[PDB]
Amino acid sequence: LCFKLYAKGKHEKKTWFESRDFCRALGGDLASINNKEEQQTIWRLITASGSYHKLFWLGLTYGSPSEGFTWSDGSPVSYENWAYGEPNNYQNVEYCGELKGDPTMSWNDINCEHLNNWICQI
Numbered sequence: 225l226c227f228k229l230y231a232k233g234k235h236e237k238k239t240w241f242e243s244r245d246f247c248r249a250l251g252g253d254l255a256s257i258n259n260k261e262e263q264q265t266i267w268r269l270i271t272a273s274g275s276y277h278k279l280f281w282l283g284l285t286y287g288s289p290s291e292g293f294t295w296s297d298g299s300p301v302s303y304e305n306w307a308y309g310e311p312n313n314y315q316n317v318e319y320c321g322e323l324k325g326d327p328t329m330s331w332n333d334i335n336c337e338h339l340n341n342w343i344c345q346i
């Protein structure tokens with residue numbers, strides 16, 4: 225699968241659901257990061273575009289209380305790269321996952337209605 229970053233204009237950020245719909249409209253989905261190689265591919269996409277210091281929706285979304293986080297594309301949640309302290313379900317309203325697009329490439333749970341950049345896979 226090919227990844228593509230979407231860091232558009234200031235008023236062009238999207239909720240998690242809007243981002244998922246955008247990627248699905250192109251025949252793909254929000255990006256799942258299944259291992260370190262895929263993480264590196266995305267990090268180099270960030271360096272290549274110069275789209276530094278941005279946050280991006282990934283395909284992380286909460287399932288049932290039993291299962292916790294899942295990937296929107298159905299991939300297993302094998303690899304995890306949560307930032308320290310995450311996921312923390314801050315104020316009980318955080319059911320989607322974002323990537324901090326810095327060298328650590330760490331993940332944070334955040335409210336799904338937050339407006340973010342996003343990363344698709346096709």
Ligand SMILES: C[C@@H]1O[C@@H](O[C@H]2[C@H](O[C@H]3[C@H](O)[C@@H](O)[C@H](O)O[C@@H]3CO)O[C@H](CO)[C@H](O)[C@@H]2O)[C@@H](O)[C@H](O)[C@@H]1O
Pocket residue numbers: 310312314318332333334335
């Ligand atoms: C939502 C939060 O995101 C990260 O923490 C950031 C922090 O979130 C604030 C948020 O701006 C505010 O609306 C809420 O009421 O309190 C949160 C906790 O301080 O904001 C600071 C900037 O002030 C940084 O951007 C933090 O990264 C994440 O670390 C948390 O787990 C949580 O998902």
Ligand SMILES: [Ca+2]
Pocket residue numbers: 310311312313314318332333334
């Ligand atoms: Ca959080």
